Structures are given as C-alpha cells and as structure tokens.
Amino acid sequence: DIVLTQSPASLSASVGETVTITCRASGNIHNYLAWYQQKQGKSPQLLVYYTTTLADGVPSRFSGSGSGTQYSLKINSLQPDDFGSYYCQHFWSTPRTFGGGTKLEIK
Amino acid sequence: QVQLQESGPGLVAPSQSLSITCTVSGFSLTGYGVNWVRQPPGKGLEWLGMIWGDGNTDYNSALKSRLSISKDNSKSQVFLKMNSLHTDDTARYYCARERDYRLDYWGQGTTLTVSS
To answer: For the region Complementarity-determining-3, what residue ranges are annotated (chain A)?
Structure first.
C-alpha cells in the first residue's frame, strides 16, 4: 500500500498569511490526489481533485500542485474560514488511503 | 440535493458484531461508489473500503477480515458490518459518495463507542 505523509502536522498562522502544505506518497500516484478541509465537528469537504482542479465554490486563494510522489496545497492570504484540518487522499488503484492531516490554527 | 445520513448503535460492548447504515437520497446507488471512512477521536481519516455502483467491493488491507460492505439498491442503503469490535474501533464513521476520483458528498457521520 501507498502511504501518504503530510507536513507539517500543525501550523499556527495569522489571517492574511500565505501557507503551503505538503502531501508525499511512498509510491507514484500519478496525479490522482484530492485535498479535503474539515472544520471542527463537521464532515470533510472536497477542495481539490486530480491535483489541481478546484471543486465548485472553492475560493481561488486555494491552489494545488504536484506530480509523482510530491504534492502541494497553497493557501494565499488566509481567511478565518480557512482554519481547520486538511487531508490529502489518493485514488491510485486500491486501497485508497488518506495522509495523516495538517491542523491549521489561528495564531 | 444529494443526501447521505448514517445511523449506528452508539455505545456497544467489545466483541459484539455491528452494522452501520448509510441511507442515501437523490442519486442512484448503481451510478456511483460509496466509501466508508472512520475517524478516531483526535486522529485523522482512515479509509475502510468501498462498494462500486456494480456491486464490487474493496477493503482496507489491515481490516479486511473483520469488515463487510453490502448494499440494498432498492432501499437506497449501504451497510458496513464489523465483526468482533475492539475498543480501538471507537471512532466517527462516515459514508461518502464517489464520482470520478473524488468523494464529493459526505454524511455527517455516526459516533461508535466501544465500551464494556
């Protein structure tokens, strides 16, 4: 199985700051990578799929990039609505797995 | 309006067996996949398995022998059955619809607590 490793596990950030989060795969996933945001007490919400495609209604402050085993999520000038946990997930063959998560908290 | 709502037994004692139901509305179980995902308290998401629109299933390697996923197309329900619960089976369980390499709609989750 392909495991996903996310870094950092947690980041403290201020509103308006630009952050980058990473998802590394232990095997080539061929761009089949989705990103989800989860706010406290809610289910996860799709943000990005197939590495760079934003889901409907996700703000353009979000951008995903990557290939091979290295992927990124960049959030430009963070808004309060953006703090919470971020997860990457691959869809390369099966089983599917999720990265461990990145907790984004307000400084 | 796509809806997925999960229902489960809440507190159960270890070693019992359990069934969790994912009731869907607004789309056909034959045109999409339904994945099962759990989240232990304070931890990340763990993929448990899925049932494809055609009835094939795939499972997490590590849990494969204790899990079974099935569905009732007629009733619009998907089930997750687990054998001999461990306390570490404590988590929030969600069903999510899959459509072209993405889990686009998720249920609110059901909490399962394995307590003696």
So the answer is: 89-95
Q: Determine contact, residues A81/A21, Cβ cutoff 8 Å.
A: no
Query: Considering only residues 40 to 99 of chain B, which have any Cβ-Cβ distance to chain A shorter than 8 Å?
Result: 43-47, 49-50, 58-61, 94, 96
Query: Are B71 and B79 contacting, i.e. CB atoms less than 8 angstroms apart?
Result: yes
Q: What are the chain B neighbours of A91 within 8 Å (beta carbons)?
A: 101-102
Distance CA B69, CA B86 (A): 18
Q: Which residues of chain A lie closer than 8 angstroms to B60, CB-CB?
A: 95
Contacts of B35 (CB under 8 A, 6+ apart): A96, B47, B48, B49, B50, B95, B96, B98, B103
- Within chain A, strands assigned E span 4-7, 10-13, 19-25, 33-38, 45-49, 53-54, 62-67, 70-75, 84-90, 102-106
Distance of alpha carbon B26 from alpha carbon A55, whole angstroms: 20
The answer to whether B45 contacts A49, with C-beta atoms less than 8 Å apart, is: no
CATH number at A1-107? 2.60.40.10
State the CB neighbour count (10 A cutoff) for residue A17: 13
What tokens appear for B32 in the block? 């999409």
- Tell me if A96 and B94 make a contact (CB, 8 A cut-off): no
**Shortest Cα distance from B72 to chain A (angstroms)?**
23
The total domain count for chain B is 1
